Design a binder for this molecule. Structure first.
Ligand SMILES: OC[C@H]1O[C@H](O)[C@@H](O)[C@@H](O)[C@@H]1O
Ligand SMILES: OC[C@H]1O[C@H](O)[C@@H](O)[C@@H](O)[C@@H]1O
Ligand SMILES: OC[C@H]1O[C@H](O)[C@@H](O)[C@@H](O)[C@@H]1O
Ligand SMILES: OC[C@H]1O[C@H](O)[C@@H](O)[C@@H](O)[C@@H]1O
Ligand SMILES: OC[C@H]1O[C@H](O)[C@@H](O)[C@@H](O)[C@@H]1O
Ligand SMILES: OC[C@H]1O[C@H](O)[C@@H](O)[C@@H](O)[C@@H]1O
Lengths: 121, 121
């Protein structure tokens, strides 16, 4: 059962554990790089890194996928865009009016799958 | 509404967006360092870094807290441990039989709070 719990007091300034995203891409996503950590293969070309600002999060995203992740694009609450990166295969699915909390997945030579954890608004 | 969606196919090896954790601790948690990104102050002492392997997640975690986070310890599904680090103040709460997905929080000179996103089994 997916949930969250807060521990501690009321001070400080908020932070998120998710800080940056890059990809390697060609016809597919070869890799995703999350907070600098590489997952996937060495093919394709490395995108610039998208670093989330304070209070910035993915609010909408389009993923093309099939057996692998073919393409990713996203936009943040600040209106900044990442991608599209990747190819034209697969089929498209979109998340809208969300707040992405985390990205897990599975990878080998390519990025096989993504598990997106998000709040739906 | 907190939710998960998977995109892509069945192959590859699993990874998590949450790759590494360290803390600065003394009496309290001065800071938490998530995937290399520092959240909190410069006091206390830096712990070693715990780096998750493929398929590995936090399965049990004990947090002591009051106004701030006093202490953290955790266990993974692979029988590995982190901590305890911090002091004996506050009161303890334990998450048991979980899969941690993300660690967010709030920080200033110390780690005021943690907002742990997880699956509860
Ligand atoms: O993205 C998959 C594949 O697409 C293309 O064929 C090239 O860009 C390769 O380098 C890459 O590995
Ligand atoms: O995801 C890679 C690939 O997987 C399958 O072969 C199909 O869904 C393709 O359209 C897609 O491009
Ligand atoms: O990522 C594409 C592909 O790469 C390798 O061949 C293995 O890791 C497979 O399991 C994976 O599906
Ligand atoms: O952890 C809070 C505080 O605890 C102690 O007083 C010392 O270890 C300090 O360096 C640290 O800042
Ligand atoms: O969390 C820091 C500190 O907050 C309060 O002063 C009390 O809850 C203490 O027991 C705890 O050590
Ligand atoms: O982290 C402890 C403390 O540090 C600062 O003084 C501010 O950021 C406070 O809001 C916070 O409670």
């Amino acid at each position: 059962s997916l949930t969250h719990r807060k521990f501690g007091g009321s001070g400080g300034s908020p932070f998120s554990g998710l800080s940056s995203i890059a990809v390697r891409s060609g016809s597919y996503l070869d890799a995703i790089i999350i907070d600098g950590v590489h997952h996937g293969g060495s093919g394709g070309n490395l995108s610039p890194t998208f670093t989330f600002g304070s209070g910035e999060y993915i609010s909408n995203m389009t993923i093309r996928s099939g057996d692998y992740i073919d393409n990713i694009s996203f936009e943040t609450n600040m209106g900044r865009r990442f991608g599209p990166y990747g190819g034209s295969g697969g089929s498209a699915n979109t998340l809208s009016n969300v707040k992405v909390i985390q990205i897990n997945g599975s990878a080998g030579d390519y990025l096989d799958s993504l598990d997106i954890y998000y709040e739906q608004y």
